[PDB]
């Protein structure tokens with residue numbers, strides 16, 4: 338039972354979301370005028386802060402909080418170490434609302450103690466296709482199509498409470514205050530993801546990993562050596578040999594994206610994302626922001642043939658701190674970002690992703706089984722990991738769907 342989430346406009350059980358048929362809001366309809374103008378009360382020792390994301394030193398304070406207190410694996414072996422440049426890129430997309438970046442500071446020292454961020458996203462989130470089918474069958478097509486237009490909502494990420502402050506009910510307060518700031522801007526839904534089960538996910542996808550540096554991965558215990566490797570003479574040379582990759586990409590006419598590619602990439606991406614039930618809609622400016630190369634952050638390649646961009650792929654970097662091994666500071670992980678293929682098989686496109694990631698020193702390539710990520714798992718030698726990313730809506734009834742019907746990539 339959930340003293341906080343039970344008070345919120347989300348489905349409360351698997352049993353409620355396995356019943357839902359149509360997309361739509363949960364709450365009573367409200368107005369900005371209904372929403373308190375004063376920030377939510379907190380204890381007298383703390384204060385609310387809006388970081389300025391163009392201030393290197395505010396970014397840095399958030400960076401440090403996340404470095405020491407953000408997402409750990411279950412065995413406390415790894416913790417994310419999102420870089421400052423990554424934080425600026427993720428928190429400041431085009432038309433971001435600074436007010437949606439919410440932090441609790443200690444009044445005395447101004448030590449940052451908690452954070453949560455919302456950025457705007459235009460998301461298609463109407464009734465899924467299979468349910469629209471049933472609706473037609475039933476004469477209920479208009480109810481099913483009512484919320485088909487892409488909606489300008491809020492994407493939540495980087496919720497983090499300082500280690501010393503955990504289990505003190507501060508996360509609910511951060512969430513209420515973020516909710517308030519967003520509703521004050523006339524946005525009523527949010528989308529978020531988590532590694533944990535909360536009430537209640539509309540989708541759930543398993544993690545997959547592709548070793549680029551297996552020796553390092555085994556040393557830090559990201560990876561195991563399978564038993565079958567023991568009935569070999571030299572376990573580690575076999576492993577290295579098995580995951581080896583070309584040093585140079587195989588698709589002729591692969592190069593990094595440039596600003597002039599923006600409209601074609603937008604067009605091929607939007608055509609592809611259109612086939613999923615849940616997915617974002619991006620403008621030219623959002624295609625430039627989210628996909629143009631920035632060093633250490635996001636890496637994006639196109640296939641151009643005959644002055645036409647026919648294929649692209651992208652990945653982004655999140656290094657993780659290796660907590661208990663002292664020979665290594667970091668796991669250097671590449672995360673599959675958006676892509677589209679029209680001219681070659683997806684596995685052929687994504688092999689070049691692995692090749693590039695490896696040649697630029699990444700240790701592993703990670704992804705969740707959304708988009709068409711399942712289609713290249715076996716041929717590219719990805720193995721399932723033990724985590725799941727669950728996808729959630731705030732104030733939005735949504736039927737259960739498969740993760741291969743989700744086209745939103747979380748940072």
Ligand SMILES: CCCCCCCCCCCCCC(=O)SCCNC(=O)CCNC(=O)[C@H](O)C(C)(C)COP(=O)(O)OP(=O)(O)OC[C@H]1O[C@@H](n2cnc3c(N)ncnc32)[C@H](O)[C@@H]1OP(=O)(O)O
Pocket residue numbers: 338339340341342343406407408409491493494495496497498499502503504505506507508509512515516519520524525526527529530531532533535731732
């Ligand atoms: C219209 C706009 C809407 C805007 C808002 C949209 C919703 C946004 C929702 C947030 C989207 C975040 C997306 C991401 O960033 S997911 C990544 C979350 N961050 C981390 O895991 C970093 C490491 N962990 C921590 O910093 C803390 O443990 C956190 C902050 C996670 C919990 O802090 P703490 O451990 O000190 O606990 P508490 O006593 O203060 O609070 C206990 C309550 O918190 C509920 N809890 C636990 N984990 C999560 C979680 N990941 N999402 C939502 N709720 C969570 C829990 O069930 C309990 O509620 P209830 O069971 O009593 O009911």
Ligand SMILES: COc1cc(C)c(S(=O)(=O)Nc2c(C)nn(C)c2C)c(C)c1C
Pocket residue numbers: 408409410411415416417531532544657668670703722723724725726
């Ligand atoms: C969002 O949730 C997850 C994210 C990742 C990235 C993974 S993971 O790749 O499988 N492992 C991992 C690494 C390399 N760093 N961190 C901080 C974690 C959790 C897992 C298991 C979960 C549950």
Ligand SMILES: [Cl-]
Pocket residue numbers: 747748
């Ligand atoms: Cl992630």
